[PDB]
DNA sequence: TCTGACACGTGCCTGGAGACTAGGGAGTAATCCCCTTGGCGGTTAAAACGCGGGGGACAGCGCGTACGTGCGTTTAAGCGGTGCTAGAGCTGTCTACGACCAATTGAGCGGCCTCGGCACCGGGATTCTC
DNA sequence: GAGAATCCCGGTGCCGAGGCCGCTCAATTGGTCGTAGACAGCTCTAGCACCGCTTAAACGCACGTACGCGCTGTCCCCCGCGTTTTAACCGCCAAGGGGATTACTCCCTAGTCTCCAGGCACGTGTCAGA
């Protein structure tokens, strides 16, 4: 009771590209823990970086900086390229 | 350009290997072979800004126009949505010189493409910021090389040339 | 007279190990840092404090790495280090 | 302006500088296959740390890198420095 | 019609927003920050599931197991650095043979 | 009451762990040392988890505090927290 | 048998340290603080998996050190280095 | 302008036991950064630990557990021995 | 008087309380948390300054330069473990020689 | 060719959006400074270059104590079935505790002297190699 | 069979710190509204603990052999000394990139009703393994 997880949406996006394959219960917990840990790391990094510049309003730029520092390699350059795809789809719509 | 307001007249085209597709740009799949390029073209005339071309821009302080040969572009940065690293040309103040220094090119400083070649202008030799050490080397021989490989090996190559 | 190789080395080790002065030259290190940052983007402003902080951090990291490589070499019945020792030290810490 | 460029200053950390660094390390002798790779290791470490510091300093609409952000970047990597931040 | 559907992201926006606000991380969290975080998390999940499926297809299996996840995260070198200090449960180890055996 | 059980992890277990590690030949002098390694690592982790549990007003050490202690030491574990 | 065991074990998944000795060892190492301490069933498995990962990493490190040392036999000094080389 | 530091308090506690030995400004900055880093580590550990048990406030026991976590060895047993003493005569005053 | 004198210490409880409040760390802060944190910080400062003074007395010096502070931060065997991967500015290296070097 | 787990309809209630005030913060556009590159001339602590040399890395060996493979026999293990009770997680109180509202006062960092501790000298001893 | 790499008598520059001034700004008193958890009860649940039926594996014993550290020979190559050389730093000029603080205002939104919504507690129809 009162268990907030990301299982449903991760499973839906699992059938977003390869609906033929499934996922086990144990590996799903591994993925949920990994995504929770990386989200916590990004949030902590963003808050810590914002507190360093006398900033108390966490906006898109702080999260972008935190994630690009956390994400290593050119993959980060790709991931950031996805983020601005959403806000442009959010402000316009 | 800075915000999206200054870059409202441009689009993004993703050339995976040799295609003119959009596909959104790195939609969902990333793996080995990520040498894809993203370029932009204005809708007024329809001229594309590839990786290895040359343009002319005016300086806010100097005032005199200068030719910059674009070497690389990075999309979705912190201060700028697009950041263009180019090589400056040492103006004599019509033969143009070449420098290996990297400079940032802004969107609103671009007015018209300068498709210079070895002999609307002509180049003479590559020079240095010190004012000497000029070698008779053209640009058409290195444009294909910098277009075919990653930018990194491009700057080691251009350093090895000098 | 000329000292045999292996006696000035030891007092050299103490004389650079007891003290803590800056050995890496400040201006060349600043130039190297500026040129490395230029590979990211041009027209960047650097102050003396940041250069000093970077130099101190590099000093500490390289001293630690060299101590680790010396330990690895002396563990292998050896007194000098080669590229294999550096690779072993680097792969086991990052 | 920016009418100044350095051509391959990777050897800025010179040979006896590496020698004295190793001497502080506590070694007896250094082979010739070290001075060419320790500079590459230093270059990679700088390419990481300076990039992190550049992101820190340009996050806040600034082009002048301070020492506080350098200290914070080293702290994020587990190699924090005291007294400069 | 929903906030997540407005940006076209499968991952939630309201859930992550409330977890940030109740998470004692910041008294003030922006409007574009949650959607940006949702987009980057969705992209990371898509990439890791792509790698897991690629690894599983080579083992002739139609399910995602921790062994496949660890194999995929270890073959990817830039993803390995981020997942360096982690311990995957029931995932085995990455096979490797040196040049001195 | 319960003593002389540190030898529960016996030498064939260390041999199997070494085979998974990627070695072919191992000396017999490493068994006591690896037992001490396990003792020290487990003592540290157990101390951290016990402090977590004592703060949490609990007495049954669950998986959550163990995973949190692992995360605090830079050894984050997935699938259990 | 060891050569086959190499990729028999790197391909295997089942745990090696037996659950019952691990449970008793944890009980004895935890009673040194307070009497009658309780542990969850899944906590024991998680802790054993963490110990597995740490020991596998340490043995890979000592294998690298040994093959660097022009030898295939690991000893106590190798693990002492493994502590003293990375911390 | 408005340079945050702990120089005066560290100097005052220095004269509490070592009236004869001084300290330099360069070393004083080192001590100030050391105090700030230990404080930040304790505070972030306490906040994360409170978030683990759905806690809403940070009490004396929160920081006590945080310093028990961070401080290693017998020194930690001394630190709490110095901590809970003060509160023992702080509330009853 | 202030709570700093009430608790019988020399470190500011009010300053750490205010900057904890402004540090975006917790919505609510207990009454005993600032005083306990001040106590532990004062104890750590006293320990490190005492170690630095002991190191200075061995070198026949009065001013504490970072060398003696590094000696203090590394000589103590449980206190050094806390600062496992720290970098001290102008700190130096521990005076020691392994028997396999001479 | 037989299984134990994994996945679609299934309701509502805690949560995600819908929407109207007033806190409240940032990139626009402003003062004068806060550090800093470029280079002006010399030089002196190092940086390169040549060369002699002696400690040490490389390579085969056969002694030689040490172990994996082959092999009994227990020995604790691998799982099924319960008796059961300490405890994690469930709602409710209400009374102790946080933020903040007026209002006030000691303080600790901007400036300024007034000393205050160390380096380097003329010039001895100090444990270093053979 | 004898040199330096410094020690310590002792004066002064010389940068640096401890009193001395000094004044806006946050610490202190404590109802009040909100709020959150120590008790108070409970409740169900899961592994302690035991018992029992099978069962993979350790404890050494024996032995051939991969292996390891010392022997001995070979070379090798980096360090110390002598000579050349080479640019950093001293002390500034000096304007220029960029920052110490308003401000604002208008839109981002906390709060709060407010209206609605979706996915997990189940679950029996399917599907990787032996």
Residue numbers in the entry:
A (entry chain D), H (entry chain H): 35 to 127
B (entry chain K): 2 to 94, 130 to 155, 170 to 212
C (entry chain A): 39 to 132
D (entry chain B): 17 to 101
E (entry chain C): 16 to 116
F (entry chain F): 21 to 101
G (entry chain E): 46 to 132
I (entry chain G): 16 to 117
Paper passage:
Orc1, the largest subunit of ORC, is responsible for Sir1 recruitment via direct interaction through its Bromo Adjacent Homology (BAH) domain. In addition to its role in binding Sir1, Orc1^BAH^ has also been shown to bind the nucleosome. Orc1^BAH^ was previously shown to interact with the nucleosome core particle (NCP) in a manner dependent on acetylation of its N-terminus. Here we show that nucleosome impedes Sir1 binding by Orc1^BAH^, indicating the need of a suitable chromatin environment for Sir1 recruitment in yeast cells.
To evaluate the potential impact of crystal packing, we determined the Orc1^BAH^-NCP structure by single-particle cryo-electron microscopy (cryo-EM). Complexes of Orc1^BAH^ bound to NCP at 1:1 and 2:1 molar ratios were observed, and their structures were determined at 3.5 Å and 4.0 Å resolutions, respectively ([Fig fig2], [Fig figs3], [Fig figs4] and [Table tbls1]). (A) Left panel, 3.5 Å cryo-EM structure of one Orc1^BAH^ molecule bound to one side of NCP; Right panel, 4.0 Å cryo-EM structure with one Orc1^BAH^ bound to each side of NCP. Improvement of the EM density with refinement of the masked volumes enclosing the BAH domain allowed unambiguous docking of Orc1^BAH^ with NCP. Nevertheless, the density for the H-domain of Orc1 still cannot be modeled, and the same is true in the crystal structure, as only one of the two Orc1^BAH^ molecules bound to each NCP contains partially ordered H-domain, indicating dynamic nature of this region in solution ([Fig fig2] & S2). In the structure of the Orc1^BAH^-NCP complex, the H-domain is mostly disordered, indicating a dynamic but accessible protein region for Sir1^OID^ binding, while the β4-β5 loop is well ordered. Orc1^BAH^ itself no longer binds the NCP with 20 N-terminal residues of histone H4 removed ([Fig figs6]). These findings point to the cause that the movement of the β4-β5 loop away from the Sir1 arginine residues by ∼ 1 Å due to NCP binding creates a setting that the β4-β5 loop and the H-domain cannot coordinate the binding of Sir1^OID^ ([Fig fig4]). Structure comparison shows that in the presence of NCP, while the H-domain is freely available, the β4-β5 loop is displaced with respect to the core of Orc1^BAH^, rendering a nucleosome regulated interaction with Sir1^OID^.
